[PDB]
């Protein structure tokens, strides 16, 4: 529910087109378009609450891959790297440094 | 470890039980479980004479 208007256009003109376009056009004249399709906070909380049901329900299980990438990477390690640590841009630079110096 | 079926066996059971804590599963205990109240009720309703 918006028109060209202009981007200074406030919010509450998608209500007032929200009135005008449907009451005035054949949307509702002629039940083209339902009333909950006409409102965009329908739109807005049908994929609000629909988003968040997504969340509670698959969000959990990606701790499965995480663990098993963490396995897959400490599996590694154990077999060629048993002293490999988060050995990251700083320790490794770190140890390199030392060794230089010495 | 190497060449010793233990390793495999531990391997593959921790790839188990992750998969079984995967998506799979997870989805179903959100789509069947909260519905077997009222198969529990559908029971009950079964098992009385009424009906028959």
Known sequence: ?102 | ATDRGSESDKHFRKVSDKEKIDQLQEELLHTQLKYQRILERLEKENKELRKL
């Open chain 1, 1 to 102: 529910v918006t028109g060209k208007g202009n981007s200074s256009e406030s919010i509450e003109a998608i209500r007032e087109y929200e009135e005008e376009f449907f009451q005035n056009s054949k949307l509702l004249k002629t039940s083209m378009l339902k009333a909950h399709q006409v409102t965009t906070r329908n739109l807005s909380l049908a994929v609000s609450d629909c988003f968040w049901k997504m969340v509670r329900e698959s969000v959990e299980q990606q701790a499965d891959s995480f663990k098993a990438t963490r396995f897959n990477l400490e599996t590694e390690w154990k077999n060629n790297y048993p002293r490999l640590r988060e050995l990251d841009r700083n320790e490794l630079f770190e140890k390199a440094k030392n060794e230089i110096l010495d």
